[PDB]
Amino acid sequence: GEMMIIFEGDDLEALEKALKEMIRQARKFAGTVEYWLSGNRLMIRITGVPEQVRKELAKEAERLKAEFNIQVEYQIRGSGSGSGEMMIIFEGDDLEALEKALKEMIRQARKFAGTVEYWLSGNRLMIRITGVPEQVRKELAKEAERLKAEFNIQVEYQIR
Amino acid sequence: GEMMIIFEGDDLEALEKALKEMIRQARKFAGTVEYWLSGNRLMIRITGVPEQVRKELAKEAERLKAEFNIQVEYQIRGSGSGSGEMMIIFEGDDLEALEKALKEMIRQARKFAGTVEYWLSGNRLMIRITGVPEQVRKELAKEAERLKAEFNIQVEYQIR
Ligand SMILES: CCCC[P+](CCCC)(CCCC)CCCC
């Protein structure tokens, strides 16, 4: 089970103060965190947490709300069984080769009933593939290595 | 001048079709693009474009709206003079060292009146610094190298 939390406030010092406390509590309960600050909005994505601590982390969210005077919202995903996550990175000085490799890597993951999230910035293209089991994450890694030699691009992948 | 465009639709094939056309037109007018697809929302960030083509790119957005039956919104930033962009990447197997380096890199950029955007995922920490001139982007690169040796982390930075 995972948990998505959003913090909003005009005081950056207050947001980051709340960030420090929230991620500590989540890690205190053996949870892997991921965060992203953009403007006055702070996203905190916590994974590997069951119903027990998700009740506590939510209570911590309400507590930091009143403490630092900021807005807070969250969503909870409990049911299963699954799945998994995968982050692939493409790099190269040829934009056409990257986007062409992107189209193929997308086709593969979506053929195997997986949801993809990609981001192109400069010469780097990052792909997040969620909703896939270990049986699939090994196959996509092979296809990622095929694209590596085919379009001569730098490729890195990490599984969690 | 830059331009922010958002596409929304339940048909992924329609979004990506519109994506291909929009980024071609932007690159056709010597514009550097950046895109991010998440769920049914597609962000397209175009930079290095004046009022002339921003009128055309907007018209292209309205055209793809009716063509693929999708939602479209955009924002335009024209005034100046400036500024610049900077992407710093921290990597390491120690989370405490990364976040401690993050706090310092944040302090430096915000002392020099710069806005920061950071994202922590796994062992990688990426920092986008906007609203800074060449005089500042050289100073932050030096401080990034200081943090590199201090916290023994892998550091990469790119200027645009
Ligand atoms: C959930 C974290 C989302 C942030 P980004 C992660 C992309 C993964 C494919 C996408 C936003 C780009 C404008 C990268 C943030 C900047 C460092």
* Chain B neighbors of A77, CB-CB under 8 A: none
- Give domain A85-159's CATH superfamily: Ribosomal protein S10 (3.30.70.600)
DSSP assignment, residue B104? H
Experimental determination technique: X-ray
A122: nearest CA partner in chain B: B34
For residue A13, with 0-12 CB atoms within 10 Å meaning exposed, 13-18 middle and 19 or more buried, which class applies? exposed
Angstrom resolution of this structure = 2.4
Q: Is B119 on the interface with A (CB under 8 A)?
A: yes
Q: Report d(CA B107, CA A41) in Å as an integer.
A: 19
The Cα-based distances of A7 to A36, A43, A61, A107, A120 in angstroms read: 10, 6, 9, 35, 26
Q: Is the Cβ atom of A10 under 6 angstroms away from ligand 1?
A: no
Q: Is the Cβ atom of A128 under 6 angstroms away from ligand 1?
A: yes
The Cα-based distances of A30 to A42, A54, A83, B121 in angstroms read: 21, 12, 18, 16
Nearest to B35 by CA among B3, B13, B64: B3
Q: Is A75 on the interface with B (CB under 8 A)?
A: no
- Give domain B2-77's CATH superfamily: Ribosomal protein S10 (3.30.70.600)
* Chain A neighbors of B34, CB-CB under 8 A: 119-122
For residue A147, with 0-12 CB atoms within 10 Å meaning exposed, 13-18 middle and 19 or more buried, which class applies? buried
Q: Report d(CA A112, CA A144) in Å as an integer.
A: 14
Tell me if domain A2-77 and domain A85-159 are identical in fold: yes
CB contact under 8 A, A119 and B36: yes
Give the nearest partner residue to B34 out of A36, A37, A121, using CB atoms.
Answer: A121
Element (DSSP H or E) covering residue A139: helix A134-150
Would you list the DSSP string of A37-105? EETTEEEEEEES--HHHHHHHHHHHHHHHHHHT-EEEEEEE---S---EEEEEEE-S-HHHHHHHHHHH
CA angle A95, B9, A160 (to 5 degrees): 60
Residue extents of the structural domains in chain A:
2-77, 85-159
Q: How many residues does chain B have?
A: 160
* Chain A neighbors of B24, CB-CB under 8 A: none
The Cα-based distances of A158 to A50, A122, B29, B75, B131 in angstroms read: 24, 21, 36, 35, 32
Q: Report d(CA B32, CA B30) in Å as an integer.
A: 7
